[model samples]
Target: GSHMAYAQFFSDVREAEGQLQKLQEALRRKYSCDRSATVTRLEDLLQDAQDEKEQLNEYKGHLSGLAKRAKAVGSGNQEAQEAVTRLEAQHQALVTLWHQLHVDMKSLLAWQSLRRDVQLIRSWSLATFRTLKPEEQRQALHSLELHYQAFLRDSQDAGGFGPEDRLMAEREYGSCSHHYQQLLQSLE
Candidate 1:
């Protein structure tokens, strides 16, 4: 009597394990690489999340059905109860993973924004600096120096400049000055 119950419970437990393994494989196959958070990839992430939700629900249903079977079999089956506990732990891990993906998506968005701003400034500087004649390049350098001095004076007048802020300004100013020197050298 109880022997038949044990056999049935073990069979169901093996089936549940198989289902859990398949779900793990599906998730691994889709998110194996770090994809950029472009519009296209964002769409895919949304769809992936939705698919995971469905799979998780299905897994829960299997676990629930197994729990009922284990209870009906009587309290002697410690293995069945342990199997439920293990699957629940795995489910918690999956939920945590979903949260991490959401956080990483926001980080990628900020990364993309920073890259866009840098590329725009870099392209403008390259085009403007390269097209100028030797005389014009010298004039532009002089103008840049004047403007930089004006900025420093204005910042000093408005308030005190923190050392960090002053340092950043000097670094940017030096970069522009070096580029102008290169442009002049290229002309000769």
Candidate 2:
């Protein structure tokens, strides 16, 4: 019946998950995964792009200085036209490159924000669990046990859970920080 079919499906899924996990472990051995690698790569890319931009700016500045000289020499000179033409092309190429770099920066920022939010959640949970007063501490520990469940329930009620998930996660994180601050202020 339906129950039997679902049981069979779940059994297959569990077996598949075990296989997948073993594969992941094997892959990890072959791959050096620094979790911060994404951030570091983005930072490097941005730095390189900035360096190129600076070089492009310098080219434009030189071009402008040459243009001023060409103007002083007179507008009708063939050499002046050639100089202006080459500089104009170089300027346009730099402008195109600048636009691409800007887009790259925006994409990287969105990814970094998501990474930061996940790190914040991890730190918040650890700190929250460690700060409870003894008696209430036990209860808080139980909540920690169910932290993932509670977060899911709260996230669902608020909306979907993500950086782009309507700022509910951000608001909750802020509240957690506020309580942590209050505890510190009370101690002193």
Candidate 3:
């Protein structure tokens, strides 16, 4: 009978609610906090959030069915109704959290990538350019300048990094510029 259906549905809804709660806790436990957590940690953390987001995306149909079932079970079972409401809200909040987490990880990763990329010119030396052909000399300056601009862009607007990061980048820029000009004047 329909009574058995409602009973069974409530059981499954409760289980699903437990699963939803557990997902957030798992995500929360891993990504809670850290400035020195390192690069691979963010990469793995992003993977976890994306995987959960994909699963939640697939669960939309199941969730909608539960909502409709609760509406039909209506008058006699406000308990069923509230359970779906709470479960649905949990789904929403988790999805929201996933997005913010996505932005947070990507932002940090981008800054690190750009900030590290700028180090290439630091490692360059006057002797390194001596081996370059005329074509290599012509192209190297433009590419290094491009990397410099990209780093500056990444470092601006507070840049999700400490002021010390900017200070170091600026100092490196000055050092690189001095050498860059020396190399320029020496070329062709």
Candidate 4:
């Protein structure tokens, strides 16, 4: 192995190390238990997760290639051994972060689904609540009563939802439940 290539490998390893940290930090920097973030902000973390995911495929290749090259050149290279260890740890950290992003994103998807259900019910019920026929009124009342009962169950105990999830869901449920109650009363 040429001295020049070994020197180049050292520099490449260092660069990869720094880049890995940069990607990890993008997700970690925003982590908080109480961030009551906007819908868009939570989604931004999803994008960052994707970016990191795509990056790691390439990075893994580069890192392993560096390690292989370093080992082939000499077993006594301290920089190579240390970098290999650090890079391995960094890779594990990233894997953990990627899963964290996944679970967190799933939490929001459920919350959003609940919110949309409320929106749909609001638009649908209000549009068709009043009719000249008694049968239609009966049907409307039945729907509100039945669906409201279901919504109560559909809305779980809010214990497992994260801070942002709980907060946003709480507020939406508050405003939505109020409207439903008012509409149900009006129907009666």
Q: Which candidate gets the maximum TM-score versus the true structure?
A: 3
Candidate 4 positional error at 106, Å = 3.0
lDDT of all predictions: 0.59, 0.48, 0.70, 0.62
The lDDT ranking, best first, is: 3, 4, 1, 2
lDDT of 2 by residue, 1-188 (tens): 34454344334434533543453343334322232447666556556556555655665665565556555544344555464665567466545645544444434444344445445434544346456565774443344334433343333422123445435544555555465456555656
Instruction: Compose the digit string of candidate 1's lDDT tens values, residues 1-188.
Output: 78877787887677766776776776656644343548457446656767787767777777787777776777576776787777777776775665455444433433343344333333445557667676875555555565455445434422223356545556666776566556556656
Scored against the true structure, residue 16 in model 1 reaches a CA lDDT of 66
- What are the runs in model 4 whose C-alpha is more than 4 Å off? 1-5, 29-36, 40-48, 75-79, 122-188
lDDT of 4 by residue, 1-188 (tens): 46777677777878877888887777667543232556576566666567667877787777777777778656356767777878878887887776665565545545554555567545646546554366764554455444444334433432355355445555665666677567667876
**Number of clashes found in candidate 1:** 0
TM-score of each: 0.52, 0.41, 0.66, 0.55
Q: Could you tell which candidate, 2 or 3, scores higher by lDDT?
A: 3
Q: What lDDT score goes with residue 84 in model 1? A: 73
Q: Model 3: per-residue lDDT, tens digit, 82-178? A: 8888888889998877665566565565556544545665566778877777687556556555545554554444325556775666676677677
